């Protein structure tokens, strides 16, 4: 078997090799790659998304989101507090105010141990979720806008045509913004470029051990847990490297840099924090081998989850027997 230890690959496509999104994604998958639930693809020297960044100052965000966390430095929650909209300019502004500016470090450790040691002290502001895209629509290779879609991908495999899109979505970040503990919607792959900015650190744990997580989950939030049978679906808990270690939960961590890609593998749960201020876009997809882990993903039906009109089809034709229970959360 490739890749026993589960350790994230790095890939360094040429650029014939990056002409074709599914066969190298094929090719990953074939040197063990998926095995960690996460991996690095750092595209070829002649390739770039898009001539400049010279003029996203005027994108709008229009529901910022304060992180507001609770509970101890290496286990808590975070709540989003809506704000008021600001344009990316005004975005960066405050990213690197007083106020919220990375603070002086001596390398990416350095900040780490300090994103862990403060984090809870701190409500940094997360432009996140926002419907589009800054690839060049002449960009060919790599382009998340231009990806083969996840209904296309179940009518290929299953025969079923269904309704629903997916498009990208962009995330403006600064320090200590923070993505919680979670897998993909219906355990899909995601694909994330950094364009521009500060580093991305991610935290991830093999899919193979992924139900170690949700059980020291749920013994660390357990009211949570009595609520929900998939809490982790809320998108809200954060677990500490060191208390992931002190209760031998397999892990890898690995820092992404502007102008690289992650991709996360179905059902590789996954976590980390922002650097500074950054955008990075990010999508779902689907292929061959995801099939088999959307029929059997969890679901939140507490409904606290609340997820994409796509999502429906999904539950519909791969989850039948769920779908009664499930769609009756959604609404
Ligand atoms: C990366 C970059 O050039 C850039 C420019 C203007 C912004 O408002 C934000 C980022
Ligand atoms: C000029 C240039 O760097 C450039 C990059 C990407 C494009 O899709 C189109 C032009
Ligand atoms: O970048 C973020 O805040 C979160 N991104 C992801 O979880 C992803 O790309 O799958
Ligand atoms: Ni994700
Ligand atoms: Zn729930």
Sequence with gaps: ????????????????????????????????????????????????????????????????????????AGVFTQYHKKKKAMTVGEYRHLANSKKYQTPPHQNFEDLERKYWKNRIYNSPIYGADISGSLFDENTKQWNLGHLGTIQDLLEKECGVVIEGVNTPYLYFGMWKTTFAWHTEDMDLYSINYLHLGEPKTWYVVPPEHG??????????????????????????????????????????????????????????????????????????????????????????????????FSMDAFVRILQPERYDL?????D
């Design 1 to 72: 078997a490739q890749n026993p230890n589960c350790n994230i690959m790095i890939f360094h496509p040429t650029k014939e090799e990056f002409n074709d999104f599914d066969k190298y994604i094929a090719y990953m998958e074939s040197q063990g790659a998926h095995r960690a639930g996460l991996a690095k693809i750092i595209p070829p020297k002649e390739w770039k998304a898009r001539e400049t960044y010279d003029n996203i100052s005027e994108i709008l965000i229009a529901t910022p989101l304060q992180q507001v966390a609770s509970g101890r």
């Design 211 to 308: 139900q170690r997580l949700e059980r020291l989950a749920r013994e660390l939030f357990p009211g949570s847990s009595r609520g929900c049978g998939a809490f982790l679906r809320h998108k809200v808990a954060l677990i500490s490297p060191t208390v992931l270690k002190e209760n031998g939960i397999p892990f890898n961590r690995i820092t992404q840099e502007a102008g690289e890609f992650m991709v996360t593998f179905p059902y590789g749960y996954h976590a980390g924090f922002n650097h500074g201020f950054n955008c990075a876009e990010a999508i779902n997809f689907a292929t061959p081998r995801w099939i088999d882990y959307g029929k059997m993903a969890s679901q939140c039906s507490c409904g606290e989850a609340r997820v994409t």
């Design 326 to 330: 499930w769609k009756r959360g959604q």
